[PDB]
């Protein structure tokens, strides 16, 4: 019925697994700033929402490969979460 929660679960899984694997892939490259889990979790949100401020980004092969998975899986899931919120909002747009 409300599979929007299932897409929300998949989004949180991508945000958590992405931030965990990013720190795992970035530690080892001199100059890398995506090397601590707390700020790496907000980087996953920056990538999945496509906002991308640029304060945090990968600079390694794997780290950028992890970002690709966060892009493909996160933007799709976040697009499904924000689409359900759009449908619900219209459902009251006529109950004026």
């Amino acid at each position, epitope marked *: 019925w409300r599979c929007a929660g299932a897409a929300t679960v998949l989004l949180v899984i991508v945000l958590l697994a992405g931030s965990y694997l990013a720190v*795992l892939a*970035e530690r080892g490259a*001199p*100059g*890398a*700033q995506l090397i*601590t*889990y707390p700020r790496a979790l907000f980087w996953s949100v920056e990538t999945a929402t496509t906002v991308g401020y640029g304060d945090l980004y990968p600079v390694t092969l794997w780290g950028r490969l992890v970002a690709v998975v966060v892009m493909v899986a996160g933007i799709t899931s976040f697009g499904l979460v924000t689409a359900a919120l759009a449908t619900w909002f219209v459902g009251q747009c006529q109950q004026q």
Partner: antibody
Framework: QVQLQQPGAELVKPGASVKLSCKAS????????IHWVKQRPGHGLEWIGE????????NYNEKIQKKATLTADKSSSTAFMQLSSLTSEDSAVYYC???????????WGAGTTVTVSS | DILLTQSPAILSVSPGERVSFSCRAS??????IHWYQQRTNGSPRLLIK???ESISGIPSRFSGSGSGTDFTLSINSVESEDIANYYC?????????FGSGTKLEIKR
């Protein structure tokens, strides 16, 4: 309680290789990193390398010589640093510290005084 | 790699006076600096995390400040137990680096 336990001292022959241990107690998280810090007598703190026991992933200080190999045993919760081909310059105190993946070292070990002499 | 300079290396001070340790970074690290204390024949002990945030179990006279490249660890009023070495350590870029260390001395 003593969260990180290290052997007291290790005597190494010139050219031999020692294996140090660091048994962890307390909360064990999948995001925990174990670090190793070398302190030569009269000098300061010198970062050797790090290892995450969850994945088996390990890193080392490129700034100095890499004489170490970091390993872990998730069953017994003990990290292992294997120093090979030791010289007189390697005689120092070797600490182990636990990092929650957030930048700082919350708890340290007592250190292991490694002496290289015949 | 980020170079942490602690100047000066020895800080002599009369008891009861305010003391400040200095740690300069080779490039801006924001607020990802951490302070440690090491007494004779002892292991390092965390004093302040993230420039200013205090740790559970540290006297209130220990405080921290700074951002960018210049950071400071202050002791409001020094007593004999504060005689040790003090190190700064950054966590902004890989790898983690320590400072050169500063020794505190008291003019009793």
């Amino acid at each position: 309680q003593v969260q990180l336990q290290q052997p007291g001292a290790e005597l190494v022959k010139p050219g031999a290789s020692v294996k140090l241990s660091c048994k962890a107690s307390g909360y064990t998280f999948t995001s925990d990193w174990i670090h190793w810090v070398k302190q030569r007598p009269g000098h300061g703190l010198e970062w050797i390398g790090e290892i995450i026991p969850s994945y088996g992933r390990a890193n080392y200080n490129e700034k100095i010589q890499k004489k170490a190999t970091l390993t872990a045993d998730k069953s017994s919760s003990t990290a292992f640093m294997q120093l090979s081909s030791l010289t007189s310059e390697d005689s120092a105190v070797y600490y182990c510290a636990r990092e929650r993946g957030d930048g700082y070292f919350a708890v340290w070990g007592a250190g292991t005084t490694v002496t290289v002499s015949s | 790699d980020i170079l942490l300079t602690q100047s000066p290396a020895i800080l002599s001070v009369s008891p009861g006076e305010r003391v400040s340790f200095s740690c300069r970074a080779s490039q801006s690290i924001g607020t990802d600096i951490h302070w440690y204390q090491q007494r004779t024949n002892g292991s390092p002990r965390l004093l302040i995390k993230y420039a200013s945030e205090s740790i559970s179990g540290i006297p209130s006279r220990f405080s921290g400040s700074g951002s960018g490249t210049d950071f400071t660890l202050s002791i409001n009023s020094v007593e004999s137990e504060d005689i040790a070495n003090y190190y700064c350590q950054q966590s902004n870029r890989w790898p983690f680096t320590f400072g050169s260390g500063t020794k505190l001395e008291i003019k009793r």
